[PDB]
Amino acid sequence: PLFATPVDPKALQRQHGAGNGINSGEQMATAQTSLYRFPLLIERAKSAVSSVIQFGNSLQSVLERQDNEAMTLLFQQQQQKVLQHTKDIQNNNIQV
């Protein structure tokens, strides 16, 4: 008789994180006045921008630890599943 064999099993396709789309550019306001001169305003604004840069670094640190915790938790779940299917293999190995 003739023989049957499946030909060319299809590999899966690549995805990407397309949650980034168009940017909506936010406009800027207008400061009215201040009766202080320029050096005191620079001495305050430089410290304010330094605070902004510090909390930007803190936000980047927290925002990467969040994704690393998500990856770690997914890996723990799927290793917990693999270590049960291995127990099924060892269940058949004693029946042999």
């Binding site: 899966l12 995805q15 990407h16 994180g17 949650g19 980034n20 980047q60 925002l63 990467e64 994704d67 998500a70 990856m71 997914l74 890996f75 799927q78 599943k81 693999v82 299917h85 291995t86 293999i89």
Partner: protein, 49 residues
Amino acid sequence: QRNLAELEQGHADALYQMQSTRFTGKELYNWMAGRLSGLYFQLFDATQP
């Protein structure tokens, strides 16, 4: 054992998908590199005078 190997292939696909759709993935560090390396030279040319 065949089903175990196919399940491990599915787990590799899941890890690669959450590496791709991660927020702090490559599409964030390309953005931060292309902005920060361009602003650092402008800060250097503002500072050196």
